Design a protein around this ligand. Structure first.
Ligand SMILES: *[C@@H]1O[C@H](CO)[C@@H](O[C@@H]2O[C@H](CO)[C@@H](O)[C@H](O)[C@H]2NC(C)=O)[C@H](O)[C@H]1NC(C)=O
Ligand code: NAG
Ligand code: NAG
Lengths: 55, 50, 99
């Protein structure tokens, strides 16, 4: 499951760059770094929430 | 957005003091070899600052 | 013997430290060199300057070289003086001697 979560967060920041919202992308990237060091899956929920605010 | 500046987001290990790693080899996040190809659990290690 | 190659790999990909004594001087480079399987682009450092003892150490940041030249591996004792401190921020796991 962790592998899919990392892929989803990665795709979210990639999209945020494409959408022209670099600050949101930067914030999501930070979620990736923290995620790769932890078992905390709520970082996905934050990546998704940030994307929803942008879209 | 100025996307010229890059930082490394994905790395297999931490750096030693004053070590300079400029490799662009695709990072393997999963259990399977990437062989230079991005995709599920394979990423280009550098992310831009927009 | 003219020189040495130091790095993680000796096949491009990663920067390698090449130290070569040729004719009149010593040429030191840290380019991502493509080496031959029998030796004898991206550069961050370049510098250009019987029993010969050398010591090579890789501390964080610097690559340290010590050396001593004495007249004549015979039994005896001497100490090696420092030669050069190279500010090369690379990973070294293997090396090769160039003849
Ligand atoms: C120098 O590079 C070597 C590889 O060429 C590194 O060794 C690898 O380290 C990773 C991460 O811990 C391991 O998963 C690999 O199995 C190791 N490979 C080998 C052949 O040992 C080494 O750690 C690097 N040195 C420094 C200081 O970063
Ligand atoms: C020593 O090698 C360098 C290349 O690294 C070359 O430019 C130089 O001319 C050589 N020295 C002599 C005396 O040929
Ligand atoms: C030098 O390294 C950079 C990555 O830092 C790469 O993009 C570039 O293509 C390399 N140039 C050559 C000539 O290999």
């Amino acid at each position: 499951d962790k592998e899919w979560i990392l892929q989803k967060i990665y795709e979210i920041m990639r999209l945020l760059d494409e959408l022209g919202h670099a600050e949101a992308s930067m914030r999501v990237s930070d979620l990736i770094y923290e995620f790769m060091k932890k078992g905390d899956e709520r970082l996905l929920e934050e990546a998704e929430r940030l994307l929803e605010e942008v879209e | 957005g100025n996307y010229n500046y890059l930082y490394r987001l994905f790395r297999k290990s931490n750096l030693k003091p004053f070590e300079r790693d400029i490799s662009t080899e695709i990072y393997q996040a999963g259990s399977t070899p990437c062989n230079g190809v991005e995709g599920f659990n394979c990423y280009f290690p550098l992310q831009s600052y927009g | 013997i003219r020189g040495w190659i130091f790095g993680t790999t000796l096949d491009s990909k990663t920067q390698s430290l090449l130290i070569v004594n040729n004719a009149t001087n010593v040429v030191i480079k840290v380019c991502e060199f493509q080496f031959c399987n029998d030796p004898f682009n991206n550069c961050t450092f370049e510098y250009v300057s019987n029993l010969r003892e050398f010591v090579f150490k890789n501390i964080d940041g610097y690559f340290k070289i010590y050396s001593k030249h004495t007249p004549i591996l015979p039994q005896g004792f001497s100490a090696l003086e420092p030669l050069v401190d190279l500010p090369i921020g690379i990973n070294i796991t293997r090396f090769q001697t160039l003849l």
